[PDB]
Each structure stands twice: as structure tokens, then as C-alpha cells.
């Protein structure tokens, strides 16, 4: 099946892309990103989400890996004074 | 000089041993690397992206910057492609 947008005609089966009438050569990764955005018009994705959805889950460390490792440190070192700064990151107090 | 010591915590960099409140603590390699980094930088706030680079290694695998440069590549190869940059959050294709 094909996916159409204003400018794009994308073939999911063959990885072929037509842009305003012209056939476009994309890398595999470029293609997956283009197709992901083109299949989800009007929706904002964070860079973290796009990394996950396009490059795949669990192939290399991400910002989630960082959060998971902090939680694991907290369990193995009870009372470890790592402060969470909601929506930024972490700080060790003492 | 092999050791970093903070409250209740003793970390030996050479032998990679962690003593917390008098107990030897078993950590994976990256748990250790993360702990030692934070203990060596008390009072300092790091973003998750910074911790990734400092602890897991800078420029070793795809990151959020790889997403940014791939959007630039798409915009170059498809001149006029309507990807919107929502600065400091991410990306949206309008239509």
C-alpha cells in the first residue's frame, strides 16, 4: 500500500518515494523517518520518540537507559542522594 | 587516589569496587560508570543527554542529534518538504 501526502507518494513495500513528481533516492534510515512522519500527519513527535520509532528500541543506549540506570542505582544503594530535576535530569548532592 | 569517597560511599576506580554503608555492592559496568561519574561531580546537574555522552560515550551510537541531521537531509533531498521544527521538542509533518 501507498501512503499519499500533499507532496509525497510512498510505497511501503518497495521503499520507493515520489516527491512532487520526482523519484527520490533515500537511505534506509531517511526512508523510515520520512515514512513515519508521513503516516502521522499533524502530530508532533519528540526527538526521543522519533529515535525510538525510526531507529528502533533497545539497539543502543537512549535517554531512557539513563533513567533506568538511575533507578537501578537507587535500589542497590538505598537512600543514595540523587536528586531528580523533573524534566531536565539528575544531580548527586553529597 | 584510586578512590572516590562521599557520604556512605567508597568507590575504587582501579579495582572497580563499591562499598556503600559497609556493604560491597555488585554493579554492572555501566551502573558503575554512572555512579562514579555522579560521585565525582557532586552538586552538579546533568541532563540525560549529557549523562549519555559522559558515561556511555560521546558519538558512539545514534542520538537525538542524529534525528536532527536526518531531518536536514530529508529537507535537502526533498526541496520544500513541509517538516515543521518545534524547537526544543521535535518535529511535525503538516500535510
Residue numbers in the entry:
A (entry chain B): 127 to 220
B (entry chain A): 126 to 220
From the primary publication:
The response regulator VbrR from Vibrio parahaemolyticus, a member of the OmpR/PhoB family, regulates virulence and antibiotic resistance genes. VbrR is a member of the OmpR/PhoB family and contains an N-terminal receiver domain (RD) and a C-terminal DNA-binding domain (DBD), connected by a flexible linker, and can directly bind with the promoter region of exsC to mediate its downregulation. The VbrK/VbrR TCS is activated by host-derived nitrite during infection, which leads to the downregulation of Type-3 secretion system-1 (T3SS1) via repression of its positive regulator exsC for maximal virulence. In the cell or solution, VbrR proteins exist mainly as inhibitory dimers formed through the DBD, and phosphorylation of RDs allows the formation of RD dimers, which in turn changes the conformation of the DBD from an inhibitory state to an active state.
To gain insights into the DNA-binding-induced conformational changes of the DBD, we purified the full-length VbrR protein and used it for crystallization, but the crystals obtained only contained the DBD. Finally, the DBD structure was determined to 1.45 Å resolution using the SAD method. The structure of DBD forms a centrosymmetrical homodimer. The DBD homodimer interface involves α6-α8 from each protomer, and extensive hydrophilic and hydrophobic interactions are identified. In contrast to the DBD in the VbrR-DNA complex structure, which forms a compact and globular conformation, the separated DBD structure adopts an extended conformation with dimensions of 31.8 Å ×36.6 Å×72.2 Å. It is worth noting that the DNA binding motifs α6, α8 and β9-β10 hairpin of DBD in the VbrR-DNA complex structure are blocked in the separated DBD dimer structure. The key residue Arg190 from recognition helix α8 forms two hydrogen bonds with residue Asn184. The structure data are consistent with the biochemical results, suggesting that the DBD dimer binds with promoter DNA much more weakly than the monomer. Therefore, it is conceivable that the DBD in solution intends to form an autoinhibitory dimer conformation that precludes DNA binding.
